[PDB]
Coordinates of C-alpha atoms and ligand atoms in Angstrom, one line a residue:
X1 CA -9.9 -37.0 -15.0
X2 CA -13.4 -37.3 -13.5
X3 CA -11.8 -36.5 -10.3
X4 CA -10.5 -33.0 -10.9
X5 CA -14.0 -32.0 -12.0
X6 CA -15.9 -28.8 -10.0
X7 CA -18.8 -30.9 -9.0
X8 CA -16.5 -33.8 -7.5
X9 CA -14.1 -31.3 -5.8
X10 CA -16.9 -29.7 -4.2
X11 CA -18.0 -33.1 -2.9
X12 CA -14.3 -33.8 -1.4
X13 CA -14.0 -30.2 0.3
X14 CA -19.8 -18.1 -7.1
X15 CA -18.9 -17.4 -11.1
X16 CA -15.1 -18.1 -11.6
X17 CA -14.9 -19.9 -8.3
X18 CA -12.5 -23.2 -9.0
X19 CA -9.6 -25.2 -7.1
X20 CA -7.2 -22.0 -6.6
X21 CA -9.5 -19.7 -5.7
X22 CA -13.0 -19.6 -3.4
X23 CA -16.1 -16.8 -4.1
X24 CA -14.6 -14.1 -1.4
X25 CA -11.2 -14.4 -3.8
X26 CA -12.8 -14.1 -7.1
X27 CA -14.9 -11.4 -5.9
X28 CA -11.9 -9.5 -4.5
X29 CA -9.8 -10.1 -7.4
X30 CA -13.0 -8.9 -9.7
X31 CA -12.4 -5.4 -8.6
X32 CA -9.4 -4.6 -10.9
X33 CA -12.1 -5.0 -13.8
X34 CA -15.1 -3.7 -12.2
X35 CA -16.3 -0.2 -12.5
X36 CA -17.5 0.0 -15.7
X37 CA -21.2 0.8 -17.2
X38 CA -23.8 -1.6 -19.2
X39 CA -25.0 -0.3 -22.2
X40 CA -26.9 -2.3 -25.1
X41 CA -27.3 -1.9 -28.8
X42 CA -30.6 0.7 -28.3
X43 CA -28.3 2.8 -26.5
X44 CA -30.0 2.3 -23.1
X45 CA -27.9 1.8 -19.5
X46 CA -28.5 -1.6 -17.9
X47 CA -27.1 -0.7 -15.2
X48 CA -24.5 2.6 -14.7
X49 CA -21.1 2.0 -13.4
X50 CA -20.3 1.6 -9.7
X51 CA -20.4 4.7 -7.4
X52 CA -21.5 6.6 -10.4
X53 CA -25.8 6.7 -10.6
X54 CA -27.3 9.6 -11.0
X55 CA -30.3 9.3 -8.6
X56 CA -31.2 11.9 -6.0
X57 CA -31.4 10.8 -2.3
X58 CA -34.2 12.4 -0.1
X59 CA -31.5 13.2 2.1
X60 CA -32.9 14.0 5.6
X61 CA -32.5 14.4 9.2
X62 CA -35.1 12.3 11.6
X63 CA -35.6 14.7 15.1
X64 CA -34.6 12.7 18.2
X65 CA -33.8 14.6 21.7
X66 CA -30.4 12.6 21.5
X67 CA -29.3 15.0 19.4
X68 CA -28.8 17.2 22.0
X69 CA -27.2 15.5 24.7
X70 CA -23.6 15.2 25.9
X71 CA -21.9 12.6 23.4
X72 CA -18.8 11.7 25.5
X73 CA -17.9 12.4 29.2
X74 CA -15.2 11.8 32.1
X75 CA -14.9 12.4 35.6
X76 CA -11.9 15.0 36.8
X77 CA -9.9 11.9 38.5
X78 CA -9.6 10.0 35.4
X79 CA -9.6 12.9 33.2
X80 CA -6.4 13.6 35.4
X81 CA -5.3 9.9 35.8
X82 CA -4.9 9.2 31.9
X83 CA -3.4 12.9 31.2
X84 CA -0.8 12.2 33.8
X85 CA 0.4 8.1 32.6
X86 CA -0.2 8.8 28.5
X87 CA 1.6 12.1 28.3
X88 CA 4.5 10.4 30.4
X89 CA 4.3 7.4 27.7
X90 CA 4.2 9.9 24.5
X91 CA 7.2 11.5 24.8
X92 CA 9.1 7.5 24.6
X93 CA 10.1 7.3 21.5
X94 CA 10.4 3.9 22.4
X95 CA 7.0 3.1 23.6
X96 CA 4.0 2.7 21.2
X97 CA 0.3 2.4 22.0
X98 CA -1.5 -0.1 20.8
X99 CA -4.8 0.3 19.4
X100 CA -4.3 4.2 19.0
X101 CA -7.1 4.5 16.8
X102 CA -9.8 4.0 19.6
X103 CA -7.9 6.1 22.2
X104 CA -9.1 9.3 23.9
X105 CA -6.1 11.0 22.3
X106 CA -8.2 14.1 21.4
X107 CA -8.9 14.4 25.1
X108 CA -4.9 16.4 25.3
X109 CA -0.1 37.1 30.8
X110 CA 0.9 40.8 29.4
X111 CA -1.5 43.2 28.8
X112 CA -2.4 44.8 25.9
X113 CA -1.7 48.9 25.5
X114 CA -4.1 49.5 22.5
X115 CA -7.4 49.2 25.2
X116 CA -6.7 52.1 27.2
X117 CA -5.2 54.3 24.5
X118 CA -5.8 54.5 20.9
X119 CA -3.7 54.7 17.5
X120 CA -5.6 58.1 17.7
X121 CA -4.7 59.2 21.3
X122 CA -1.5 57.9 20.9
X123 CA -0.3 60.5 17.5
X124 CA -2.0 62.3 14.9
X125 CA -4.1 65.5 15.0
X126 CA -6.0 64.4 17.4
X127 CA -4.0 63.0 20.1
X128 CA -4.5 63.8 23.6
X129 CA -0.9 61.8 25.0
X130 CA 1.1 64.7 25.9
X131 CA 3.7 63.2 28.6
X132 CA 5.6 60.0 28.8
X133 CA 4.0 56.8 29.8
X134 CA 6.3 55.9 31.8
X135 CA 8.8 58.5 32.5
X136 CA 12.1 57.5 34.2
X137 CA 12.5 57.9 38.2
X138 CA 14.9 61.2 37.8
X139 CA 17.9 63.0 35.7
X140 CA 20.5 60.3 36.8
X141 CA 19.3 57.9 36.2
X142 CA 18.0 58.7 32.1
X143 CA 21.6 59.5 31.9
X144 CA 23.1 56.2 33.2
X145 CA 20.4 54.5 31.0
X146 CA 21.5 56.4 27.9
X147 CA 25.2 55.7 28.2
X148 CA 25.0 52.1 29.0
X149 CA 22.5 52.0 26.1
X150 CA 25.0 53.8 23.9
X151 CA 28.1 51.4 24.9
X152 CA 26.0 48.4 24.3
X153 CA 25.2 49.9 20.8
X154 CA 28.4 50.3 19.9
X155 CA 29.5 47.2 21.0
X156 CA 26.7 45.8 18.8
X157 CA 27.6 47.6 15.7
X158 CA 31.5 46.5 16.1
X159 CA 30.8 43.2 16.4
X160 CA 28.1 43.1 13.9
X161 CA 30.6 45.3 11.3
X162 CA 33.2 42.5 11.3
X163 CA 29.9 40.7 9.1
X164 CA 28.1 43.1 7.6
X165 CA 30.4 46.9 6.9
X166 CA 33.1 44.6 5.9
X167 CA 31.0 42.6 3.8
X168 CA 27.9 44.0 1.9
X169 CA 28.8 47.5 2.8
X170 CA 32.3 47.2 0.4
X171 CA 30.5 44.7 -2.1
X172 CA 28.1 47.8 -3.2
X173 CA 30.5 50.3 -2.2
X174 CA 32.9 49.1 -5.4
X175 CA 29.6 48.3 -7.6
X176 CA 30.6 44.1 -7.2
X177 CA 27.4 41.9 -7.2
X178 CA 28.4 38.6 -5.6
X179 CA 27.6 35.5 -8.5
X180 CA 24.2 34.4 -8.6
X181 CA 23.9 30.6 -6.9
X182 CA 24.1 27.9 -9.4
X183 CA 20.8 26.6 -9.6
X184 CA 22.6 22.9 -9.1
X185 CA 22.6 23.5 -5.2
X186 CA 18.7 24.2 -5.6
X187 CA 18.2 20.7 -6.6
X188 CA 15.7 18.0 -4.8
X189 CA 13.6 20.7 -3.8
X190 CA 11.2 20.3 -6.8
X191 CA 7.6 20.4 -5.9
X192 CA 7.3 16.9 -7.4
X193 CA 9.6 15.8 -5.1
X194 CA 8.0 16.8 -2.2
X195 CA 4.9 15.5 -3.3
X196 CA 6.5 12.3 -3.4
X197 CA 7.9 12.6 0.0
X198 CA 4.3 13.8 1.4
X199 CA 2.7 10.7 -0.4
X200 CA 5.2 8.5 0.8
X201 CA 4.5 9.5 4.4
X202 CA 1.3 9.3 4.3
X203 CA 1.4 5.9 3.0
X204 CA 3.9 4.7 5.6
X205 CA 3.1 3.0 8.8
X206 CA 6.6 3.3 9.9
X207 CA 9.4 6.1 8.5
X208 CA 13.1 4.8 8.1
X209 CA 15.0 8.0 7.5
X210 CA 18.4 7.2 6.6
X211 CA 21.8 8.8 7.8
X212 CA 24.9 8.6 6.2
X213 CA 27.4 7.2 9.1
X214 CA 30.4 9.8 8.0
X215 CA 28.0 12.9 8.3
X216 CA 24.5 12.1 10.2
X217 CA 23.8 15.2 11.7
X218 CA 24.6 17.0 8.4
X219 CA 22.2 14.4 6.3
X220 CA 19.2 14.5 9.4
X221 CA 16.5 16.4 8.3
X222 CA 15.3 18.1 11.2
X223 CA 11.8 19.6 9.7
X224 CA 10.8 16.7 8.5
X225 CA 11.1 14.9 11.7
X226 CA 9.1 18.2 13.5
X227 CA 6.5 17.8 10.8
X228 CA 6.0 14.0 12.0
X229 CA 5.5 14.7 15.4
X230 CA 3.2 17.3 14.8
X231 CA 0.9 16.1 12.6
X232 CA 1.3 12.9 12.0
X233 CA 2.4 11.2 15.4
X234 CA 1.0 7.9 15.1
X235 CA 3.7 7.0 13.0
X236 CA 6.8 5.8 14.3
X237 CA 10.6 7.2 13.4
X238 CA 13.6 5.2 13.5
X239 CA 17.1 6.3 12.6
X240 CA 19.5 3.8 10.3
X241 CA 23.3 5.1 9.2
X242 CA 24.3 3.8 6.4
X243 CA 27.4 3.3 5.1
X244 CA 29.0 2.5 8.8
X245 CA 31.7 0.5 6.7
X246 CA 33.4 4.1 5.5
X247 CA 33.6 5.4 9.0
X248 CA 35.7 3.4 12.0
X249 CA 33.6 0.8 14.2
X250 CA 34.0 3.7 17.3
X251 CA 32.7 6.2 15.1
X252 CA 29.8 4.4 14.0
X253 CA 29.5 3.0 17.8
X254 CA 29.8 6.9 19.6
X255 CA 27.1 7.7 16.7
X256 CA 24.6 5.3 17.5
X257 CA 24.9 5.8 20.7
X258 CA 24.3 9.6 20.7
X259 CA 21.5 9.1 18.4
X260 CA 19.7 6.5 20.3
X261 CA 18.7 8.8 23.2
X262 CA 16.4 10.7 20.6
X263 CA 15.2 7.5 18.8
X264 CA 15.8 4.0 18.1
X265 CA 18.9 3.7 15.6
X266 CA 20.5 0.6 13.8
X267 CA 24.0 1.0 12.4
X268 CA 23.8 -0.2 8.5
X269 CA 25.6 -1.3 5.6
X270 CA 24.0 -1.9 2.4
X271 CA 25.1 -4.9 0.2
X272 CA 24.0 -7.5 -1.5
X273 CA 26.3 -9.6 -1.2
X274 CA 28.2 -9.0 2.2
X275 CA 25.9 -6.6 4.4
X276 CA 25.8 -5.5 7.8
X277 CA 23.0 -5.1 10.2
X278 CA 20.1 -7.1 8.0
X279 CA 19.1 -9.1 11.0
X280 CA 18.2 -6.3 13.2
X281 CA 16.7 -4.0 10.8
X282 CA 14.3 -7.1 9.7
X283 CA 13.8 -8.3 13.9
X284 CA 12.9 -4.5 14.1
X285 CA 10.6 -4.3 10.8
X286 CA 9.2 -7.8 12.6
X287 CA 8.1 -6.5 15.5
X288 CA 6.8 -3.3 14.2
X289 CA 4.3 -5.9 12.1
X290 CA 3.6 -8.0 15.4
X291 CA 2.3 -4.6 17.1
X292 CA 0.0 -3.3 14.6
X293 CA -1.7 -6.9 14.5
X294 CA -5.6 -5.4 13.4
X295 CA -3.8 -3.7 10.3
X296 CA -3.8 -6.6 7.1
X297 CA 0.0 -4.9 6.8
X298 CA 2.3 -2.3 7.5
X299 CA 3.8 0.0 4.7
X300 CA 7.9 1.4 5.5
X301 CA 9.0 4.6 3.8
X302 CA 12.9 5.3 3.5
X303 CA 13.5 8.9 3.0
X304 CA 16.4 11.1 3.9
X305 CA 19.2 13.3 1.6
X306 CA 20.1 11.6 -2.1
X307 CA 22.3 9.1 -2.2
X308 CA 22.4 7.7 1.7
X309 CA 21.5 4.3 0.1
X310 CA 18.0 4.1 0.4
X311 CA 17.5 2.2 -2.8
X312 CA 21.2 -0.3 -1.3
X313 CA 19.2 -1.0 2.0
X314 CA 15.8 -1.8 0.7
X315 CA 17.6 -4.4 -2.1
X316 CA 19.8 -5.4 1.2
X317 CA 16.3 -6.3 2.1
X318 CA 15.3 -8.7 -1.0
X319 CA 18.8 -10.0 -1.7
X320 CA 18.3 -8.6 -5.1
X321 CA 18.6 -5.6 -7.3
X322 CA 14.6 -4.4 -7.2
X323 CA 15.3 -1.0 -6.8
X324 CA 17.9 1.2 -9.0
X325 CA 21.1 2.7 -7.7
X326 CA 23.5 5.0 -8.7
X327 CA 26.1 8.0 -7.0
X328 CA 24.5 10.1 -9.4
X329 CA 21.8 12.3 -7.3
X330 CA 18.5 12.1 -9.0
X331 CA 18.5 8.4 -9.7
X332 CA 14.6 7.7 -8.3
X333 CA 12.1 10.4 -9.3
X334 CA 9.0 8.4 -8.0
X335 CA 8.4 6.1 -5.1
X336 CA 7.6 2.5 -5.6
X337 CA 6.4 -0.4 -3.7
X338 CA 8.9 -3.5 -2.9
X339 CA 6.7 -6.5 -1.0
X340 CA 9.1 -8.1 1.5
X341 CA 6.4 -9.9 3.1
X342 CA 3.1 -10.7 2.9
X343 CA 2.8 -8.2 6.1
X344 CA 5.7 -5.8 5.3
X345 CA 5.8 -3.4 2.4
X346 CA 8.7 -1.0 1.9
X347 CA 8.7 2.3 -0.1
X348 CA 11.3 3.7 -2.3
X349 CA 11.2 7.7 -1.8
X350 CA 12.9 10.1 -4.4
X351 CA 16.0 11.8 -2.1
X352 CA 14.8 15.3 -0.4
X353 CA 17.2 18.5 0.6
X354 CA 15.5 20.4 2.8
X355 CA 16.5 24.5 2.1
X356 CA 18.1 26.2 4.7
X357 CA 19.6 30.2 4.1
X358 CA 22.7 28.8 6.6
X359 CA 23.1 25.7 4.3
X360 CA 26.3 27.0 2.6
X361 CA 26.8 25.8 -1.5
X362 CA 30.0 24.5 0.1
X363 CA 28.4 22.2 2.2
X364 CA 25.7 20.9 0.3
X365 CA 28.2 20.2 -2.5
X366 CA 30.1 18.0 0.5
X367 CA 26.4 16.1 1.2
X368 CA 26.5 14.6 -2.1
X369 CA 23.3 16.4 -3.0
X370 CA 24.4 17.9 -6.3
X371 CA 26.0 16.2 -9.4
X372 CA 29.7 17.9 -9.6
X373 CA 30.0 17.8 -13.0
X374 CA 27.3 20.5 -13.3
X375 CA 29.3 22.8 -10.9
X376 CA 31.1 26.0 -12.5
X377 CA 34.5 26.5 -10.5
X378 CA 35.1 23.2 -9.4
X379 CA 38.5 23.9 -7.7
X380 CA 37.6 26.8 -5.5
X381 CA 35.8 24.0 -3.9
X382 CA 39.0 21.9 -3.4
X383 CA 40.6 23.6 -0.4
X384 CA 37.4 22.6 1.5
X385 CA 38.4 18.7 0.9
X386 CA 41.5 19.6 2.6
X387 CA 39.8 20.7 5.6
X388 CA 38.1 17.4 5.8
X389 CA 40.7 14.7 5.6
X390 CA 43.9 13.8 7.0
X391 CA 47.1 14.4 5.0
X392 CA 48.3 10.8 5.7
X393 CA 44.5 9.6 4.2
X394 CA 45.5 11.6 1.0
X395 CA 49.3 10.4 0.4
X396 CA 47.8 7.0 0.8
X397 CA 45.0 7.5 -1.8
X398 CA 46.9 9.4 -4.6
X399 CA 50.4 8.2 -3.9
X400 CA 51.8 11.9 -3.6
X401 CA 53.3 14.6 -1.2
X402 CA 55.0 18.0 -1.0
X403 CA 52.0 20.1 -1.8
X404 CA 51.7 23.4 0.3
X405 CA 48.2 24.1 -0.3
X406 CA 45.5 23.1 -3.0
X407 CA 46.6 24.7 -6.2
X408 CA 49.8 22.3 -5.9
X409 CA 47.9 19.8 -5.0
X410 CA 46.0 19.7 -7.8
X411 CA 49.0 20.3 -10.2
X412 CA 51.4 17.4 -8.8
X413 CA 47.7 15.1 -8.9
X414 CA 47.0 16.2 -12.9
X415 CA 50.8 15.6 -13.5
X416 CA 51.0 12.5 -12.1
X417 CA 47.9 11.1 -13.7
X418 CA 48.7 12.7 -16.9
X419 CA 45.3 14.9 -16.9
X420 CA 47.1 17.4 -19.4
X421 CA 45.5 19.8 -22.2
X422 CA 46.2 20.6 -25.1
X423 CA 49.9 22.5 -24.8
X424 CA 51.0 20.6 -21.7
X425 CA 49.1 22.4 -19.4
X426 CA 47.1 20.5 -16.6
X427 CA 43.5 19.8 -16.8
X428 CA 42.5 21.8 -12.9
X429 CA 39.0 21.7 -13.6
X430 CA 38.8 17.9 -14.2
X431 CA 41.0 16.9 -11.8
X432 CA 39.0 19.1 -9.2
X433 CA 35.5 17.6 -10.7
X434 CA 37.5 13.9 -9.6
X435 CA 38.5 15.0 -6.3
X436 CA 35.2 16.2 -5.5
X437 CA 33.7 12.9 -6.9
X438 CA 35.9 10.7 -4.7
X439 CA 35.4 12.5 -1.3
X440 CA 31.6 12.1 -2.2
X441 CA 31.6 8.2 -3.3
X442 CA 33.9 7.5 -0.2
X443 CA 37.2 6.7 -2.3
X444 CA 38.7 9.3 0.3
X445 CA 38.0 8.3 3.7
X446 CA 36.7 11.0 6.2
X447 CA 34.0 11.3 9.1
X448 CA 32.9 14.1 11.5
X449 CA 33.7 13.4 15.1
X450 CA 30.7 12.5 17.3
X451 CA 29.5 15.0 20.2
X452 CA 31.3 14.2 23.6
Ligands
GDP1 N1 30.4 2.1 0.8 C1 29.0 2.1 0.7 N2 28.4 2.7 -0.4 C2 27.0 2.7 -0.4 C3 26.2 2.1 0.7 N3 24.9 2.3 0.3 C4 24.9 2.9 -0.9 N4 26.1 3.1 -1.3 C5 26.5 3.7 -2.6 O1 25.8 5.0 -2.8 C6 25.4 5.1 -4.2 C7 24.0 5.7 -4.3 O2 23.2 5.1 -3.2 P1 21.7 4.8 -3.5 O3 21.3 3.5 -3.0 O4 21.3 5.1 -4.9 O5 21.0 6.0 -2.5 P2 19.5 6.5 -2.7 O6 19.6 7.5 -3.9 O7 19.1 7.2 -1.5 O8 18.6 5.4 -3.1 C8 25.5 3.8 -4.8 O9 26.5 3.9 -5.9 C9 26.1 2.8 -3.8 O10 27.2 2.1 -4.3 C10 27.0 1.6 1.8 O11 26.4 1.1 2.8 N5 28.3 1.6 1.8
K2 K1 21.0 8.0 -6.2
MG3 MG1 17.2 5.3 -4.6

């Protein structure tokens, strides 16, 4: 074995250095064990830990008249010239800059009544404003103002009463307090959560935020997207819709093509075995690594609602189950970090559901954001399922017909599936709790027609 010896392998070709690795490796690879201070049997430091002494810098300033000049200048042509061509390239969503870093990119009438009169002039004890700003042209005129005014206000109030009298107005009137929400529909709104999300962005060179194909304007989240471009536009935002295999092929075509106007977007199906769209997203994820060629690698962050298959794609990835998946919403709390390449990392995100007052409990129980088991009056719920599927997709399903409306639905289901209590009488809750589970988990097929 004289042959394998250091001192003969350095004839053929610092401290650890050997065959697998040279002294730049060893002292990269020392850093997960460095950081730590040097003390002896006395008591005294050898040496204090990295970025940790204790010494005092004379920290000054040396005078130098540079200090006062102009730092960075342009002329007005090119000042002009490169506002004009980079403003038209920012707003491409399919155009990115290379080497943004060292870019200029920094380089990017009413008046007011309180400075001729005063709080004071205006009222109090002592105002002077005795007449009428503006006071109308004549008699007529005030009167033709006040009675168009009056008709618009009471067109106003009749449209607005439909809402409102009808509504809040009764609700009080009887002493009824509509039920408090359930605080199932406030879930993935955690503060943890969102710190996740924020880390995860932060982290990512490039955003996938994923749509499911059967609802992808319900599961975009718009204010994430505005966040992105506003403070954060260096990174790039791609659309994929998952689960395209529920949906119709037209569907999922008409989809992608309305969404591609805003932003590149790859129809996706996640699985691990039979999977479509794999090639594309990877080719995408490729080039996306051949552009930012001065970074060592680029990071990709999946985000979007709970269970839109972020965890499904990113194993689609690896061929293999790295990441956990489950209907259940909640399944990943934290992110994590999945190397595909040597120069492409991907990022598991917990799932995020942005709050919105117009968000109904109706429709964020039809995202899949909540676990339906949690949910109080499951069947009140179940008319809403009929509002979203075809008759014919339901006879085929459950094997049944002749229901009027969803209270016989339900029955003739729990009858035929033998979902009886105690007594003979049918389990409704249950039954509705499984109905609401299949139109989420896609046993039901549905979709939302795409824009014209
Ligand atoms: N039919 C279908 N189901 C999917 C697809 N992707 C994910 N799922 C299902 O959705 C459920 C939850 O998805 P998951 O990957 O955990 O989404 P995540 O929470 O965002 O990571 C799983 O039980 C999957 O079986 C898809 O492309 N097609
Ligand atoms: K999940
Ligand atoms: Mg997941």
């Amino acid at each position: 074995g004289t042959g394998k010896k250091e001192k003969s392998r350095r004839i053929r070709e610092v401290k650890g250095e050997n065959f697998y690795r040279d002294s730049k490796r060893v002292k990269f690879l020392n850093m997960y064990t460095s950081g730590k201070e040097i003390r002896n049997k006395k008591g005294n430091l050898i040496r204090a830990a990295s970025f940790q002494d204790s010494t005092i810098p004379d920290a000054r300033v040396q005078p130098d008249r540079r200090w006062f000049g102009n730092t960075r200048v342009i002329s007005q042509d090119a000042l002009q010239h490169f506002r004009s061509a980079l403003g038209e390239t920012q707003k491409d969503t399919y155009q990115v800059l290379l080497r943004r870093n060292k870019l200029p990119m920094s380089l990017l009438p009413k008046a007011r009544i309180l400075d001729t009169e005063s709080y004071a002039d205006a009222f109090g004890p002592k105002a002077q404003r005795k007449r009428p700003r503006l006071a109308a042209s004549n008699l007529e005129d005030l009167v033709k103002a006040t009675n168009e005014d009056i008709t618009k206000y009471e067109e106003k109030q009749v449209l607005d009463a439909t809402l409102g009298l009808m509504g809040n107005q009764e609700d009080k009137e009887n002493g009824w307090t509509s039920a408090a929400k359930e605080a199932i529909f406030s879930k993935g709104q955690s503060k943890r959560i969102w710190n996740e999300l924020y880390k995860v962005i932060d982290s990512s060179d490039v955003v996938i935020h994923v749509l499911d194909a059967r609802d992808p304007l319900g599961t975009r989240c718009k204010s994430v997207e505005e966040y992105m471009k506003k403070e954060t536009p260096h990174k790039h935002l791609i659309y994929v819709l998952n689960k395209c295999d529920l949906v119709p092929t037209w569907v999922a075509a008409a989809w992608v093509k309305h969404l591609s106007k805003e932003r590149p977007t790859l129809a996706f199906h996640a699985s691990i075995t039979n999977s479509f769209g794999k090639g594309s997203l990877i080719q995408l994820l490729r080039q996306f690594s051949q552009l930012h060629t001065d970074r060592k690698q680029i990071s990709v962050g999946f985000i979007g609602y709970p269970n839109t298959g972020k965890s499904s794609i990113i194993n689609t990835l690896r061929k293999k189950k790295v990441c956990q998946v489950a209907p259940i919403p909640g399944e990943t709390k934290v992110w994590q970090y999945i190397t595909l390449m040597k120069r492409i990392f991907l990022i598991d995100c917990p799932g995020i559901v942005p709050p919105s007052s117009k968000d109904s409990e109706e429709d964020i129980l039809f995202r899949g954001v909540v676990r339906v088991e949690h949910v109080t009056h499951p069947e009140q719920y179940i008319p809403g399922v009929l509002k979203r599927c075809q008759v014919k997709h339901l006879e085929r399903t459950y094997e049944i017909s002749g229901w009027k409306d969803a209270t016989e639905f339900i029955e003739i289901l729990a009858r035929k599936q033998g979902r009886l209590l105690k007594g003979g009488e049918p389990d409704e809750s249950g039954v509705s709790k499984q109905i609401l589970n299949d139109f989420n988990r896609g046993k039901i097929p549905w979709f939302v027609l795409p824009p014209e």
